[PDB]
Amino acid sequence: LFNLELGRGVLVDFGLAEAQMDYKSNHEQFCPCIMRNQYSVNGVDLTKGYPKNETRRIKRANRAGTRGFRAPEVLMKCGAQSTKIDIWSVGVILLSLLGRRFPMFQSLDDADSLLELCTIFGWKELRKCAALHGLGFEASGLIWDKPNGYSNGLKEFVYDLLNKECTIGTFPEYSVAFETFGFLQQELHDDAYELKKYQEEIWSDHYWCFQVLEQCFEMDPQKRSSAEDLLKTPFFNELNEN
Amino acid sequence: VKKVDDVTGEKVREAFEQFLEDFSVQSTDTGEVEKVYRAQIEFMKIYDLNTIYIDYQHLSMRENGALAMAISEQYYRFLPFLQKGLRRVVRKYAPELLNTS
Amino acid sequence: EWQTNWKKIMKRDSRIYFDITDDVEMNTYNKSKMDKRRDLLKRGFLTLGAQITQFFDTTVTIVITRRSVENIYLLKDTDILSRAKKNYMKVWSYEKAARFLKNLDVDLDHAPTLSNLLHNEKLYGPTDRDPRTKRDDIHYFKYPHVYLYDLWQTWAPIITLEWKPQELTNLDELPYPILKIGSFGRCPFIGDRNYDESSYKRVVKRYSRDKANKKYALQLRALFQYHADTLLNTSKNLIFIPHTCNDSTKSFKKWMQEKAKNFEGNGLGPTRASVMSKNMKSLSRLMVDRKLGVVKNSGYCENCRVKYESLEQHIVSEKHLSFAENDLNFEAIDSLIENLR
Amino acid sequence: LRIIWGTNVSIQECTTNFRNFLMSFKYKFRKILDEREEFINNTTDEELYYIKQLNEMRELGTSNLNLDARNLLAYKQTEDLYHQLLNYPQEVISIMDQTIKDCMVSLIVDNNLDYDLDEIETKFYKVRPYNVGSCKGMRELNPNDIDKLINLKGLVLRSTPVIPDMKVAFFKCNVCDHTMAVEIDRGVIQEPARCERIDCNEPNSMSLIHNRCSFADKQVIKLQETPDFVPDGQTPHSISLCVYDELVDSCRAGDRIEVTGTFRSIPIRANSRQRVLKSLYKTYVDVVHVK
Amino acid sequence: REELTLESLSNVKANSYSEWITQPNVSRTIARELKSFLLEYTDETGRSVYGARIRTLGEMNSESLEVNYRHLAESKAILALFLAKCPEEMLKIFDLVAMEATELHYPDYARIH
Ligand SMILES: [Mg+2]
Ligand SMILES: [Zn+2]
Ligand SMILES: [Zn+2]
Ligand SMILES: [Zn+2]
């Protein structure tokens, strides 16, 4: 909950707030995903297809959360969950502000949300993310508009989310999105000098904002930055007044 | 044509071969290590018998029971492999028993 | 050190023929296993990336012969060993090639236990079948599909989506989210469906909504313009970054360019088992709509573990009243009521 | 939506109703139903009955739940489920088995118990409804009562030895020794007319290996009817019951048993040479519970 | 026994060359040795004439291999004599040999011809 005029907020809901328990009662044991203690051929493959009448139980991992803010580690059933996932939920909101779209992901199903993450990033990134939790991803025959789409970065993504917007005319004249649009026209190539150095202000701000946005949007749980390191990033260089 | 091989059948045959060759028993204060089944094979060679008597108690000990499960539970499947293993053991030890004589 | 000085020509001047003839009479099973050696050396040379010529030439670097390299004294002028002597060709034998391979530090060998075999046969059926054949026990993929599974195969696959080609038609609605962009804050995957933002009937809405929504955004702009921290707001008034992309205001001025007098449920769910019986799956084929044969609040109840169609009748039900009247269930919360007070 | 063709049964609604019945049934409901409200004791008639039964079956490792059908009449939500179970025993009992598995999984997970879930998931749980409506004898059942859950009561006279009923047919190639394992489907096994191996496609290479197939226990029991109502002039009747895979040899000759099962009819071939069935069907009972 | 060489091919255990060539022990030997002949034979300048002929055949989708009789006679005289002797059993083994040789360079060629 954030008051703009006071300019600060509070985290209110906790009904679904799970408590982490210890890692042990450098990617060898935190995330081969061994949890549930179930980590302890000829003629069959089990990679090209699934059994017709399956006699195996599905993984049971926590799925509590909200559509469209679920992290990759909670989208593919993964035990040994950590606080890192909440960091992902920070980026999506940060992605909602940059692009002016609030419902970032429809996320009708876990598979649907995972394929939504395939469109912005790419099939290979999602498969290499899955290969970390011990799971294999596979998708083919699908008409994706860009294979490995938005590889220049999430920068190009917000730029397209802004392109359709800046061609049809969906933004007002007193808009703030035009600054981001003109800064991505910098990053992508495709008196009154407060104009120039406020120009430099908002451009440096956007340049570092996308850096924190991509640290939040990382597939690897461990190599994803924590809250402390994310707060020490030079985008937030206004903490000296403390 | 490449005939399909029963991998576990071959494994059971090999386990039966080592059971027939290397099995040993401790006598009751009348001798040292004796190989029961090689002695039985040479016995039925001398007396021209056709039947070999395999004790299930002896068979259970070998292969930590893994030969025992497979022979007792899938006997109709592994019987030809047991026959092949016995025939090979006779072919190397006492090779004159493989003919009707 | 043979692993470097010989590996420099390994990538640029390294093309080798494998001989297929045999000098002396041989057995058929032995013929098969020498074919297996020929393939083994083939993929031991292939892994390192060396090119191979099936067609013997004069630009061939090495030949490896099951033929006797040695005893070459008497041979036909057309026989390949004679022309290997003839063009400085590096002539080897399969034993010499195996020695080279062992000196390459590459593995010669690229279920062990009967108990492990029986454990594998407890699942996956038996092994008395062709290893590489459509098992007819596992549903195989032939159409566009998405499949997320466990490589350890310890858990059931999480995602198994298999769409027929006719389902891939009608690109207006796919069974999967193809990225769409959208406008006016739309969820990118959601399109402008039955919405034409270029329709003036729509345009007189968004610009006008922007007119009433103008100064709320002006206040917010002036309050968050110069400093991220809002404690230093009070201090030319408004500054803007120039742009050239057309607008809602620009669109509406265009529509007066073009049209006006001118031309152109509850939140929880029951815990269901994962394994579906064969009979239950078979019953799914026989389903028909309820048109043949035979209070909006509805959802699960974690207290009673029963699903209700009506809240005002679940709370007055027997089990819910019994649960509420029992103070032993509400014990840990009883610590908090008076722990704070 | 999506009810089953030919039945009133809807999988979702029936599953929900049976789960609610299992989670929230107490025997005081039946005591009220039987107009015996003054026998109601708060100690054992106020505990969830089937929750305790599910816990006991989990602890003991058993797989069969004995469901009293009349209990479904006590619960309000399952007043229709009783008629659905009586009218369509096959679909309803399958749904009940699935619901029992879900219920036990929920009992283990929701209460966070220590019990392993691997052996629960791989276990096949079965429901045995017994106390269905007792009337109509056996001779008063019409062809409209075929495939319905009926309740007979009588004396066991005879029982055939254990008959092997093939569930999986094991074929073997006479050429390449490649084997597929066909599954039975409504009593018909699709014999392969070609080796599925791509290497050899010999048409009649496949031969059935009788001793390597998968078999299940089937037994036929001769029962003498002892109905509550006997119409004038009729003589005692004998029927054949079919017990399957755990109920074999559970009834010995001379036993007085009350058996609940499906009233079935099968066409009997006139001769062993040709495939011609008789237009007059033969009636029997597939036993699901023996008391 | 069941596999022969080029030297041992001359000695015929059958009454006539037809039974010799039809004999599987000789048929597989002839097939292997013609497979070798198509691969190894090269011109005096260095060009593998059958190499270029296979590439031309693959690049033109033709089903005719223009095999010469000098090259067979000079390289393998006994097989050229066998071909001149019983050209029905031969040109049936070697057509298969040529198919194998053109499939090695041009895989998945049986679908075309
Ligand atoms: Mg909440
Ligand atoms: Zn993980
Ligand atoms: Zn409740
Ligand atoms: Zn076959």
Secondary structure blueprint with pairings:
This is part of a larger assembly, with chains A (about 240 residues), B (about 100 residues), C (about 350 residues), D (about 290 residues) and E (about 110 residues).
Chain B: H1 7-22, H2 36-46, H3 56-61, H4 66-73, H5 75-92
Chain C: H1 2-5, E1 15-18, H2 28-46, E2 51-52, E3 62-65, H3 80-86, E4 90-93, H4 94-103, H5 114-122, E5 138-140, E6 145-150, E7 159-162, H6 200-212, H7 214-223, H8 248-258, H9 278-283, E8 287-288, H10 311-314, H11 318-325, H12 332-340
Parallel strand pairs in C: 1-2, 1-3, 3-4
Antiparallel strand pairs in C: 6-7
Helix pairs in contact in C: 6-8
Chain E: H1 6-9, H2 17-22, H3 24-40, H4 49-60, H5 69-75, H6 77-85, H7 93-105
Bound molecules: magnesium ion and zinc ion (3 copies).
One zinc ion binds next to loops of chain C.
PDB class: replication
Keywords: Helicase, Activation, Kinase, Phosphorylation, replication
Entry title: Structure of MCM2-7 DH complexed with Cdc7-Dbf4 in the presence of ATPgS, state III
Could you characterize what this model shows?
Chain A: Belongs to the protein kinase superfamily. Ser/Thr protein kinase family. CDC7 subfamily. This is part of a larger assembly, with chains A (242 residues), B (101 residues), C (341 residues), D (291 residues) and E (113 residues). Chain A is 38% helix and 5% strand. Chain A is mainly alpha-helical and 242 residues long. The two termini of chain A are 22 Å apart. Chain B has a single domain (4-95), classed as 2-Layer Sandwich (mini-chromosome maintenance (MCM) complex, chain A, domain 1), CATH 3.30.1640. With 341 residues, chain C is an alpha/beta fold. Chain C contains 12 helices and 8 strands. Chain C has helices spanning 2-5, 28-46, 80-86, 94-103, 114-122, 200-212, 214-223, 248-258, 278-283, 311-314, 318-325, 332-340, and strands at residues 15-18, 51-52, 62-65, 90-93, 138-140, 145-150, 159-162, 287-288. In chain C, helix 3 links the parallel strand 3 and strand 4 (90-93). In chain C, helix 6 (200-212) crosses helix 8 (248-258). Chain E has a single domain (24-113), classed as mini-chromosome maintenance (MCM) complex, chain A, domain 1, CATH 3.30.1640. Chain E has 7 helices and no strands. With 113 residues, chain E is mainly alpha-helical. Chains A and D meet through loops of A and loops of D. Magnesium ion binds next to loops of chain A. Residues 173, 175-176, 178, 195, 197, 200, 205 of chain D line the site of one zinc ion.
